[model samples]
Target: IEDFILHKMLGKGSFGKVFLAEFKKTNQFFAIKALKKDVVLMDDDVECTMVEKRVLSLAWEHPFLTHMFCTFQTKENLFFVMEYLNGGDLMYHIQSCHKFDLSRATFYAAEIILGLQFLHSKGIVYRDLKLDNILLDKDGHIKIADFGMCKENMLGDAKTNTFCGTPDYIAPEILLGQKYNHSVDWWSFGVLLYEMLIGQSPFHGQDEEELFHSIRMDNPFYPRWLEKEAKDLLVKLFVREPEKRLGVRGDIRQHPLFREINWEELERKEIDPQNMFRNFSF
Candidate 1:
């Protein structure tokens, strides 16, 4: 508990300071997140704080999710020892590139699909599915991070009580306070897919009010350069009818967008980024 030699400050987040820390003798390294108590209370993040801890504890069980080492508490703070991802997050790369090519986007979406499927099977819904929360490791494998927005014990098809999601990715059902399921995640998958190829959010609103209205009512425009498979998948993903959503009734493995993906090898993390159209590594 509360022990490690701090290597350096990795970065600062809204609620905590992250450090590159190590167990000097064993040569073990970790990204130690130290969250201040006052900020937690001030920001009313108590629920998300503990929700994250609970999810991180089990994250290691899955290949695509980030793993946790241990956790402890101090008088002024809470400690989360986590895996150190050398490569930066996807958002960092996306901002500069504007949009990724079809092959690269397909690979990423395939990996992310598996990760979300794992969490859903465990009855947890990741409310926040954005580029910022997905990070890359040294080998360029995708690791879904930030379980702060996760809702748990979501077993069965009944709707869960919640009003949470990123402005851009919030599903229409969630906004209307209607019964929703894991299909919401697929809706976000659509938004994410659209963003990767179109280089911007599919919905346009002058503000949050209008943005959500756009999400609930507006149809996404397909660019001439966009692949037809991606376009067709996005259409299914954006279906407002909960039962009609692309992934609600079953897995998205059979979706045409991922026709070339070898599901077995992808789950084993055997896909190498060297074959991606863009030679870029993040």
Candidate 2:
């Protein structure tokens, strides 16, 4: 902890604050998340805190996921030093630009799909998926962050019953308290895509009760302006039946909306940066 000089606050949430920090040893910059030990222990959130570190350790090597250099603890705080991404998060950019064009949204969605595919292959279910958790790099590539709600090593046939996730983005089965598997993530992914295209969540309501009811009962209305392929993809992903979801049967890369994407080039991150950062007026 003494090895790094902390700078300004980057962000904060219910659990902790993130700071921009520079390591003295290598002069490398990172985002250091400080979790208060007192609050974690008192709230019985110790296991969840540790799970975030475990998930970060497993996911760091992927290009589309944030990398955690190391983690340490003091009597009062537990810290996670992660790769610094200064381009800010998707939510910031989305709000700044109002919304993204179809080309840009498709580009970002393709990268997110790859990231989720990697995590699912490793048997990890990212229970929370939203724009706020997707960060952009200097090159404008997307990196999925925040693993505090991740469930690790759940086999292909295994199911978990925990009800956790943002209201508008959570799957119907989760709100219903049914046993769910990785398909829950696909549901959240659908919500994310819908938000990106519509500039708001499809099932957003006046309050928590209304929001949950809309999520469980109402169908996401596809804008008439949306391209057929994009709308079709969103509909497939937002299906009420988990087994009928877009990615459950096979690779999501095979979807029609992504037919133009070069999976090999995308996996290797060889896409042209101009396509990603086309409109920077914001």
Candidate 3:
């Protein structure tokens, strides 16, 4: 209806399409994520989209999360402007590099943990935690995007049973079709850390049945290539029992792997570094 011609399709999911667009009002560039009205309406639970909106409204304030600038609606669609992360996603970077060194993996894992900690503190569970959802702004730092599949435990009383999220990172409780809590994020984080360091998932089978069986047993094989400390941490985080999984700040901070991280200094560091903007801008 307007002159804001779409230049490129950024990414698409089962729900809708995202495009790179320009705002005619300010001539400012932005990423326009269009959610199809019909698709959302057809969902068995209308709260699927409602909860996503609810989570984004507050979650965007965190530096590690992609900011939701504004939302609007057209006759046929719902649209939102998200702070564009032109540097692409972590999966793309991992694929490009083939594998990450210890220092790079450590830097990224710290940020991922910070983001998960912030969300968990706010009573938000980012169920879909994986490399594909970890976008990068102009600089290489992590920005956890894609909240369409996210849900919140607002009063800290809700438990999820919908069995949502990506297959590779699904936790045991989720796989078992049992009620689950935000602890699932911790398990996914472990999967992410393992993939980054070792270049593949810990449990891999030829098909879904095999994958599910492997996940249920909670067996994460550590290759000789991974750091012994990292392997140990992964084992602890990827435990079968949700009750036994690591909590964000305390459990993670006390771990031997992060023993050298000056937690106070890290927390005080600029959320977004100035140098990142110099190298890349979105």
Candidate 4:
């Protein structure tokens, strides 16, 4: 704490904000997520906070996930020291560019799949999967960030019943208050892919209540311009049953939609030539 230099605020929350900071000793850049201790206790988010810490620790072993250096605390707040990603979030890029081309979206979807697969294999459910939570590194590779809504120890067939995650990306089963598994993220994957390819969300309503109803009752509309395989693959992901979802069976890598992607090279973090077009533009 004594040798740390605080910079600007990167993000904000109810309790506290994430700050761009640097360690004076090594001069290394980090994003400090500072959580107010009293707010954590009052909001009953201690469990979630602890789970975030554990999830971040486990994520260090993966290439497409944000890594946590350590956590410390003062009397007022708890601090999370995390690697600073120079490139902004996917949401920023999407808002600016309106949408990405097929090759670019496919590249990001592949990387996100790898990251989600790693989390599932490790018994973690990354309940959040919106563009806002996915950040790009300086190299144009995407890394899944934000673990506040994640649940752990969800190995095979494990379930949880908390009404969590962003409303637009929440799965149908979650809205029904039924027990759900890791496939929730797959539903979100479909929603995100549609947003990226189409430049808009699939479901829409006037308010949260109407939005939840739309998510439960509506089938996403595909435009005439979408490719054959892209629409077909999204159909599989947009299923109602959790087990019937596209991503649960691990068969997506063989799906024709991703035939051009090399999983081995992708897992090794080799350069993806797709979205590097605007690598560092703000």
Model 1: runs farther than 4 Å from truth?
Answer: 1-15, 22-28, 41-47, 274-282
lDDT of 2 by residue, 34-87 (tens): 887777767877768777887788776688998888887765678888889998
Greater TM-score among 1 and 3 belongs to: 1
- TM-score of candidate 3 against the unseen true structure: 0.88
Q: How many backbone clashes does candidate 1 have?
A: 0
| lDDT per residue as tens, model 4, 1-282 | 666899889997323688899899888999888887777777877767777787888898999999988888766678888899999988889999999988899999999999999999999889899998889998889899888888888977689888888889999989888998898999999999999998899889899999998998998899898898999989898888887888886598888989988898998977565221111111
Q: What are the lDDT scores of the predictions, listed in order?
A: 0.82, 0.85, 0.75, 0.85
Worst 10 residues of 1 by lDDT: 273-282
- Model 2 — TM-score against the truth? 0.93
Q: For residue 254, what is the lDDT in candidate 2? A: 86
RMSD of 1: 8.2
Model 3 C-alpha lDDT per residue in residues 1-282, reported as the tens digit of each score: 164667789888435688888877767677777775666666643456565556667766666787767777665666767677788888988898877887778777887888888887787788889998888778667788777777676336578787877888888889888887788899899899988988888778799779888888747778787888888889888878787777632478778887766655554454333111121111
Report the poorest 10 consecutive residues by lDDT, candidate 4.
Answer: 273-282
Q: Candidate 1, residues 165-269: lDDT per residue as tens digits?
A: 888988998988887778789888889888888889999899999998999889999988888888888888889987878788555799887888889899897
Candidate structures ordered by lDDT, highest first: 4, 2, 1, 3
- Give the poorly placed runs of model 2, Cα more than 4 Å off: 24-27, 274-282
Once model 1 is optimally superposed onto the true structure by TM-score, how far is the C-alpha of residue 46 displaced, in angstroms?
3.6
Candidate 3, residue 74: the lDDT equals 62
Comparing 1 with 2 on TM-score, the higher-scoring candidate is: 2
